Design a protein around this nucleic acid. Structure first.
Ligand SMILES: [Mg+2]
Ligand SMILES: [Mg+2]
Ligand SMILES: [Mg+2]
Ligand SMILES: [Mg+2]
Ligand SMILES: [Mg+2]
Ligand SMILES: [Mg+2]
Ligand SMILES: [Mg+2]
Ligand SMILES: [Mg+2]
Ligand SMILES: [Mg+2]
Ligand SMILES: [Mg+2]
Ligand SMILES: [Mg+2]
Ligand SMILES: [Mg+2]
Ligand SMILES: [Mg+2]
Ligand SMILES: [Mg+2]
Ligand SMILES: [Mg+2]
Ligand SMILES: [Mg+2]
Ligand SMILES: [Mg+2]
Ligand SMILES: [Mg+2]
Ligand SMILES: [Mg+2]
Ligand SMILES: [Mg+2]
Ligand SMILES: [Mg+2]
Ligand SMILES: [Mg+2]
Ligand SMILES: [Mg+2]
Ligand SMILES: [Mg+2]
Ligand SMILES: [Zn+2]
Lengths: 48, 141, 134, 129, 79
RNA sequence: GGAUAGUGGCCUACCAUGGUUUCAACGGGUAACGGGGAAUAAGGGUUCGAUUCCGGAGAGGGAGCCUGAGAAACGGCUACCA
RNA sequence: UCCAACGGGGCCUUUCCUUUUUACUUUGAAAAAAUUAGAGUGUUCAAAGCAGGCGGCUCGAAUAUAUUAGCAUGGAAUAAUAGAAUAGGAUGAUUAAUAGGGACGGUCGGGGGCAUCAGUAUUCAAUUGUCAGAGGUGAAAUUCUUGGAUUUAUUGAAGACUAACUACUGCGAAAGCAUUUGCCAAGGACGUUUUCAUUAAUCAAGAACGAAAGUUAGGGGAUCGAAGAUGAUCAGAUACCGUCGUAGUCUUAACCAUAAACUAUGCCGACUAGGGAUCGGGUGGUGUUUUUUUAAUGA
């Protein structure tokens, strides 16, 4: 206990935070997969 | 398992199981000998010679390709070191540290490492005296 | 590794270690230095001679009380006064002031008993098998 | 630093047996290890083992059948006279015919019973039971 | 479950060079063709020196921490 | 070289500077004569061994001798100490 | 005549030249007698003592016992020790240990020493505007202040120290180490089809560094500050606070060698569970940020 419980709390929060971030990336990649599945001046400047 | 340090690294070279020359190697053994003699004449140490031959000439291992180690090949041709190569570099490293300590007397760190290098020299010097590679009267500075 | 050498040629280190460490024992030290009898009640002897100074409980009323059986004795070897038990009040008659008594190990704090008076066993005197020589 | 390869081999076998592993890998190999394992094999404490040559000290793979209660090395390798053998069997074995004490003698590495039969003696290597 | 005596080839490829059943080098040698001269030179995969074409004295590779980086424009084959 | 029954720094003369020692020399303690043996112990060990046999040494304490094959003798001799 | 075994004799596996011993263990002598173990024997029994009986009898101690040292002997392992070993046409041996050392490559680090650059902050000083308080405490008093205190603005000087970034992250043998840039040497890990070949582990004896405080002699002296002085001694949550402040805090050259100098826990080697986060190196894949014959290489 003491200081050691507090340090445990921080690591668990970071671990929980990482899970949320990773799930967001997986969700986004699924959207990209679905998206992939489904003026003269501007064309001259499309490369920029 | 470093001595004089807490490191436990295992980095090393892994000699291949086969002790015969590679099939793709198609250079005469004699030509390899002349390259070793030339590089030693230029002043390269046996460790450096093997690196060059392996790097640019396809010599996987001198002993495998020619049947004799680089140290033996040079001595067979009159090229021998004044003192063993590993002992040579240890002394040179100590000399550089002693030169730095001369200019910088407050570098207590360099003072500590000089003891480690010097004590390493005594252990290595003692080994060569026992084998008679080094004359018995030999002492470090 | 148990913290001791185990090599087949390490007998010398094992021997010398044992000799140094044997002195840690209090029993070993006393045995070697000859100081084991300092704790003895009589300083190494099994019996001690003494001089009867007084019969301290002589005035007590209750017969064969523990106090009635106590006599103060001066040890002749070192002059230290001590208390000794007599087997019973009947044996208290044979003991008189200024007589030589032999003491042996036995009211807490009384750790001796009288075994001989004037060179004659009390039990023999109590059993009427001898007369006290004066 | 590695003092006794045989001790390491026997301890690895013991840990494999304790954990229930069906096979164990031993590095480095040695002639003494091979003879000791052959004695264990002859007494049935281990099964097949295969030696892998790597142009170095080598390796061994030993298959385990769960019949090994214990195997150990007696270090230092004490000198043993023929009269002394019984004493050793009294100290290292839980019962009298339960297990063997292995000796390196002038006639090779063998268990104590074979040494008694051949009337040979030497140093003690270890025990198995 | 695995057979220590007959490990899978993919399994050993993942292991460290020294930790396999029989340790062996993971490095190799290359036939690198000089751009300027078109001559072929042998170059070690993890070369620690700037290998130069003998005929043209043109750098063929540059040393790095691990595998040597072959110079731009140099074609290579595994030998 | 002397002396001895005889080897030998045993002693003398002249020479060198050697010899032992952390694998414990040297010094100190020993209620230390040594052993065969005695006790205990399951085994390893621990202790005791003045004391029936063997060996050593002594004859109140130091020193020196005669005789004799053999003694530095003491129930032989001479001096000194008590 | 041929084949398969069992058996004999000769050769060959050398073109020419240069250039085992010990430890340990087995067995046998030896290790006085008495003592110990053992065999026989009606000392009336026993403790003991003891070797010969019948007229050839195949009758009777058959005996054993000693750790070490010396002697002789049989040994294939183990542990040391050796080689004109697998040599050269100047010269003999085997591996190259997921032992160790050295070398090379690109890195990595708040590791170290010497210079150098910056940052506000504290104190002080110059100039500047205004006017009665400022300070400090739980509350006050010394104290400073109408020659302008405290506060404001533009600056300068001195000596320290590197906030936030700062994290169960990094380096160093430990103590310890956070601004930039350069120099000097050092170092762990990683990569290596380079090199030496046992060079190693533990360590009495013997050696280097060692927070803070402290001692000697110079320098410096902003902040804080043991000691000392002084204001107040009213009120218990604010109960010991306020002002001046010596040594000290900083640095140079030597001493001191102590910390709760902690895993409150000798070192080296091997093995025995799962999980994913992070730092450094390396390998492979992939697609985003990238970007272009200057070069150079990232996330
Ligand atoms: Mg290194
Ligand atoms: Mg470290
Ligand atoms: Mg290495
Ligand atoms: Mg262990
Ligand atoms: Mg003389
Ligand atoms: Mg005695
Ligand atoms: Mg005596
Ligand atoms: Mg005696
Ligand atoms: Mg006499
Ligand atoms: Mg007398
Ligand atoms: Mg006569
Ligand atoms: Mg006399
Ligand atoms: Mg007389
Ligand atoms: Mg007489
Ligand atoms: Mg013997
Ligand atoms: Mg290696
Ligand atoms: Mg480097
Ligand atoms: Mg103003
Ligand atoms: Mg960092
Ligand atoms: Mg900063
Ligand atoms: Mg000063
Ligand atoms: Mg600390
Ligand atoms: Mg460990
Ligand atoms: Mg990584
Ligand atoms: Zn070219």
């Amino acid at each position: 206990s003491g200081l050691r419980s507090f340090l445990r709390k921080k690591t668990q929060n970071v671990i929980d935070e990482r899970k949320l971030r990773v799930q967001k990336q997986l969700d986004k990649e699924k959207n990209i997969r679905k998206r992939n599945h489904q003026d003269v001046i501007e064309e001259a400047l499309s490369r920029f | 398992g470093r001595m004089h340090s807490a490191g436990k690294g295992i980095s090393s070279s892994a000699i291949p199981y086969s002790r015969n020359a590679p099939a793709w190697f198609k250079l005469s053994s004699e030509s390899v000998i002349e390259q070793i003699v030339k590089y030693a004449r230029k002043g390269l140490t046996p460790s450096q010679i093997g690196v060059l031959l392996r790097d640019a000439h396809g010599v996987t291992q001198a002993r495998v390709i020619t049947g004799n180690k680089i140290m033996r090949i040079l001595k067979s041709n009159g090229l021998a070191p004044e003192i063993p190569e590993d002992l040579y570099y240890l002394i040179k490293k100590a000399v550089s540290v002693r030169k730095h300590l001369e200019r910088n007397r407050k570098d207590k760190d360099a003072k500590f490492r000089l003891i480690l290098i010097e004590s390493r020299i005594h252990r290595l010097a003692r080994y060569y005296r026992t084998v008679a590679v080094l004359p018995p009267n030999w002492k470090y500075e | 590794g148990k913290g001791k050498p185990r090599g087949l040629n390490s007998a010398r280190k094992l021997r010398v270690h044992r000799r140094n460490n044997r002195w840690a024992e209090n029993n070993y030290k006393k045995r070697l230095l000859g100081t084991a009898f300092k704790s003895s009640p009589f300083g190494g002897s099994s019996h001690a001679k003494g001089i009867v100074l007084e019969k301290l409980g002589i005035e007590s009323k209750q017969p064969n009380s523990a106090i009635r059986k106590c006599v103060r004795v001066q040890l002749i070897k070192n002059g230290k006064k001590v208390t000794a038990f007599v087997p019973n009040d009947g044996c208290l008659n044979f003991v008189d002031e200024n007589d030589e008594v032999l003491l042996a190990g036995f009211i807490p704090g009384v750790r001796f008993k009288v075994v001989k008076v004037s060179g004659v066993s009390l039990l023999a005197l109590w059993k009427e098998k001898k007369e006290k020589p004066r | 630093t590695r003092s006794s390869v045989l001790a390491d081999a026997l301890n690895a076998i013991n840990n494999a047996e304790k954990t229930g592993k069906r096979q164990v890998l031993i590095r480095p190999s040695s002639k003494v290890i091979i003879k000791f394992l052959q004695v264990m094999q002859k007494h049935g404490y281990i099964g097949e083992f295969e030696y892998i040559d790597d142009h170095r000290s080598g390796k061994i793979v030993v298959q385990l059948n769960g019949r090994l209660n214990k195997c150990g090395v007696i270090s230092p390798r004490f000198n043993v006279k023929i009269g002394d053998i019984e004493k050793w069997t009294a100290n290292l074995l839980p019962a009298r015919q339960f297990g063997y004490v292995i000796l390196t003698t002038s006639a090779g590495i063998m268990d104590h019973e074979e040494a008694r039969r051949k009337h040979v003696s030497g140093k003690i290597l270890g025990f198995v039971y | 479950v695995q057979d220590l005596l007959h490990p899978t080839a993919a399994s050993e490829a993942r292991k460290h060079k020294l930790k396999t059943l029989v340790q062996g080098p993971r490095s190799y040698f290359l036939d690198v063709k000089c751009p300027g001269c078109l001559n072929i030179t042998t170059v070690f995969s993890h070369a620690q020196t700037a290998v130069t074409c003998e005929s043209c004295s043109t750098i063929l590779c540059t040393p790095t921490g691990g595998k040597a980086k072959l110079s731009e424009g140099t074609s290579f084959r595994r030998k």
